[PDB]
Amino acid sequence: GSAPKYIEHFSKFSPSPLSMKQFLDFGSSNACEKTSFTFLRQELPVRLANIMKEINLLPDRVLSTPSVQLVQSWYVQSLLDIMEFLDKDPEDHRTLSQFTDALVTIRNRHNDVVPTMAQGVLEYKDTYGDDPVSNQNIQYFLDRFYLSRISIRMLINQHTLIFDGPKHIGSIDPNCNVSEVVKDAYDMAKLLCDKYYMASPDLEIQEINAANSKQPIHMVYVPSHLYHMLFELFKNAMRATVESHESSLILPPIKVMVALGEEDLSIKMSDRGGGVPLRKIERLFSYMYSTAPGYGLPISRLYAKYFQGDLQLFSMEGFGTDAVIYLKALSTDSVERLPVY
Amino acid sequence: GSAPKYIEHFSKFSPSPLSMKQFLDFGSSNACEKTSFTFLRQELPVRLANIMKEINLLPDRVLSTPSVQLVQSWYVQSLLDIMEFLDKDPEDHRTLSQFTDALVTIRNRHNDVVPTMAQGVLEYKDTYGDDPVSNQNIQYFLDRFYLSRISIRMLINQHTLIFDGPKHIGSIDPNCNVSEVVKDAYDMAKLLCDKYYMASPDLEIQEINAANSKQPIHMVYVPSHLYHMLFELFKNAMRATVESHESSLILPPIKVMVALGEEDLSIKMSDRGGGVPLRKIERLFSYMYSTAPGYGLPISRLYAKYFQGDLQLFSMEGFGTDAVIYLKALSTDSVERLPVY
Ligand SMILES: CCCc1[nH]c2nc(C)ncc2c1Br
Numbered sequence: 001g002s003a004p005k006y007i008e009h010f011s012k013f014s015p016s017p018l019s020m021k022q023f024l025d026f027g028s029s030n031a032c033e034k035t036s037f038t039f040l041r042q043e044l045p046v047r048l049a050n051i052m053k054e055i056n057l058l059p060d061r062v063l064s065t066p067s068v069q070l071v072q073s074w075y076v077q078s079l080l081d082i083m084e085f086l087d088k089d090p091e092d093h094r095t096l097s098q099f100t101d102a103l104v105t106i107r108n109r110h111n112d113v114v115p116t117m118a119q120g121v122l123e124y125k126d127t128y129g130d131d132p133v134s135n136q137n138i139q140y141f142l143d144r145f146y147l148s149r150i151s152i153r154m155l156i157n158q159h160t161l162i163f164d165g166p167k168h169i170g171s172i173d174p175n176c177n178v179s180e181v182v183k184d185a186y187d188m189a190k191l192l193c194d195k196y197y198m199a200s201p202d203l204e205i206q207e208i209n210a211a212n213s214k215q216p217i218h219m220v221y222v223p224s225h226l227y228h229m230l231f232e233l234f235k236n237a238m239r240a241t242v243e244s245h246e247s248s249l250i251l252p253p254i255k256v257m258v259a260l261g262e263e264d265l266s267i268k269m270s271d272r273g274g275g276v277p278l279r280k281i282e283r284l285f286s287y288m289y290s291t292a293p294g295y296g297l298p299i300s301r302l303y304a305k306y307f308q309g310d311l312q313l314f315s316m317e318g319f320g321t322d323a324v325i326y327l328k329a330l331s332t333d334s335v336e337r338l339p340v341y
Numbered sequence: 342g343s344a345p346k347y348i349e350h351f352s353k354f355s356p357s358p359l360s361m362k363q364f365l366d367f368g369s370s371n372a373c374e375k376t377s378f379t380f381l382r383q384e385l386p387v388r389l390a391n392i393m394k395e396i397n398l399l400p401d402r403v404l405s406t407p408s409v410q411l412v413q414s415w416y417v418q419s420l421l422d423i424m425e426f427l428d429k430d431p432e433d434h435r436t437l438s439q440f441t442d443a444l445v446t447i448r449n450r451h452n453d454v455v456p457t458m459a460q461g462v463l464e465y466k467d468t469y470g471d472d473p474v475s476n477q478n479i480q481y482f483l484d485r486f487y488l489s490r491i492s493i494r495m496l497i498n499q500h501t502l503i504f505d506g507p508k509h510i511g512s513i514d515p516n517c518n519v520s521e522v523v524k525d526a527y528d529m530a531k532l533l534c535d536k537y538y539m540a541s542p543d544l545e546i547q548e549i550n551a552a553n554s555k556q557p558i559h560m561v562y563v564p565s566h567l568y569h570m571l572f573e574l575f576k577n578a579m580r581a582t583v584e585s586h587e588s589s590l591i592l593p594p595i596k597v598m599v600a601l602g603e604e605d606l607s608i609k610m611s612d613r614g615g616g617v618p619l620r621k622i623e624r625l626f627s628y629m630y631s632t633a634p635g636y637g638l639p640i641s642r643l644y645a646k647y648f649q650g651d652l653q654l655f656s657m658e659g660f661g662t663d664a665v666i667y668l669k670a671l672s673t674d675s676v677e678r679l680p681v682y
């Protein structure tokens with residue numbers, strides 16, 4: 001076969017990160033389908049090949065494991081499926097139809113990568129140990145591999161959702177109300193909290209629109225990404241609040257503040273769930289130390305970094321914990337953050 | 342002379358970090374003066390030589406500057422002053438008397454090191470530029486050099502204050518009331534704020550003693566270090582609060598929470614001074630970017646790290662800023678953090 005040659009070829013190119021503005025242009029209408037096709041048939045084999053080349057540079061004890069070999073085989077087959085469209089005529093509507101179907105197949109083929117990679121981390125822990133050096137190398141790899149996974153699925157979702165034969169532009173909402181996304185994630189976490197604990201903290205949301213007080217805070221963003229981050233944080237905040245008050249009756253609420261500045265849109269979640277000692281904070285974002293015989297927090301932070309944001313945790317042991325999602329307020333500053341190869 | 346030989350010799354030893362318990366033993370009585378003397382005449386030339394060896398490894402464009410050469414000459418003269426006591430009899434009370442006087446001289450000789458080192462940073466910026474790589478190397482050096490300065494002055498202060506011919510043990514208060522230290526630093530910052538701005542925010546302190554609610558929070562610590570950190574934070578919080586409300590009448594207070602957990606003693610300061618964009622947060626701790634034609638925040642963080650703590654900043658642009666001082670709650674966990682050589 002030619003898979004090694006394709007990896008070598010397309011890995012010589014750097015991924016081209018896109019801004020929110022560029023995403024809104026690719027999705028502005030159905031006429032852009034041909035442009036999206038000619039862009040993606042080149043960009044997807046670049047992004048695939050770059051992460052596939054990094055996967056081949058892993059130590060032999062990692063590379064030869066069934067999980068890494070299984071993931072590799074998926075990224076080889078996906079790479080080859082895109083290779084078929086490099087010679088096809090974009091003017092043939094059938095070519096465009098086949099391309100969209102191929103992307104859906106690729107997306108589904110990789111649906112179980114995150115659980116498959118977690119199995120590998122557990123195997124490593126039991127086969128070679130959970131030492132700090134291993135933690136750093138695994139953390140470095142998975143942060144980049146998961147960041148690479150997010151950027152590829154973003155490209156695929158934008159094409160398949162928009163060119164299917166409007167206010168939202170695929171997965172992007174140009175008028176995303178952050179508080180509405182905050183109330184959706186809470187309600188879902190609450191539903192689970194009531195089922196498991198038969199009790200749930202209330203929610204308090206406050207908005208600070210510095211430039212235009214009292215005006216609802218809106219932004220251009222991917223609400224599914226924002227939901228994932230807030231849902232993961234709400235689940236942790238509710239578990240901590242309920243469990244730390246099992247012997248008392250009062251249940252402090254979870255407070256959320258949504259602040260809009262000149263360049264930051266910040267979302268702080270605050271609970272009184274007893275807190276975490278500083279020594280144990282970084283373990284919460286570690287793939288290796290979070291793997292036991294999930295990855296919500298580390299992946300949530302990658303969603304935040306993906307458009308030049310961040311997700312940070314600050315606790316006060318004996319009281320509670322704060323989490324801040326930092327997002328870019330302006331679509332001009334919202335640009336893909338891709339692994340530096 | 343023999344200064345290079347002494348540096349080479351004593352730099353082969355690792356500094357011996359001390360715990361709070363060990364500090365309280367050296368200062369438990371005046372009979373320990375001889376023990377403190379025999380320990381310090383060996384430990385001080387180890388700590389001096391180790392940082393002096395790192396200073397000699399700086400690039401030639403840094404090492405040959407007047408500021409670095411001036412600081413070096415002080416650390417050479419200080420090293421040699423301790424060398425004189427290596428052969429003296431600890432049983433001779435005169436030897437002990439001379440040793441204490443020598444330490445006071447050494448301490449005063451280095452009193453202007455922090456302003457002298459800042460002049461060097463400014464010279465570098467104008468002579469070679471303010472690029473990121475330079476920022477990291479300078480930050481790495483000064484964090485270790487200033488951490489090394491703190492640990493040496495701690496040793497000297499404990500000897501000179503206790504053996505001068507009790508509740509507090511030198512600079513250590515075994516029953517330090519954190520809230521009392523918080524109210525002292527605020528009052529001082531307030532006095533300056535009223536002079537410069539003719540207006541100052543109020544203070545609100547809340548304590549959370551998780552294990553024993555309502556009981557005042559005490560710890561073993563160096564209150565002068567805690568004062569320095571809180572004073573620096575209060576000055577920034579007051580400046581931000583006042584300046585961001587010059588066009589309004591309400592002046593939000595500065596809130597402080599003092600939480601005591603099983604291993605952390607955490608102090609959170611919260612203001613509504615308009616906040617800082619995430620992009621600019623790290624510049625606040627940078628020596629190079631804080632130098633303009635002071636160093637309170639970076640040095641404050643070193644005081645926190647010195648006994649295994651930390652100082653972290655989290656802002657919300659358009660609203661305000663939080664700062665958390667993390668300290669170890671237990672004297673057993675409060676151990677000197679010295680530069681890794
Ligand atoms: C908004 C903060 C969410 C939160 N709260 C927590 N409490 C404990 C005890 N551990 C982890 C977490 C996390 Br993540």
Ligand SMILES: CCCc1[nH]c2nc(C)ncc2c1Br
Nearest residue numbers: 577578581610616662663664
């Ligand atoms: C307790 C937080 C103290 C604080 N507040 C600030 N506000 C601005 C605008 N810049 C820097 C700081 C700092 Br440091």
Ligand SMILES: [Cl-]
Nearest residue numbers: 110113114149
């Ligand atoms: Cl994947």
Ligand SMILES: [Cl-]
Nearest residue numbers: 451454455490
């Ligand atoms: Cl010094």
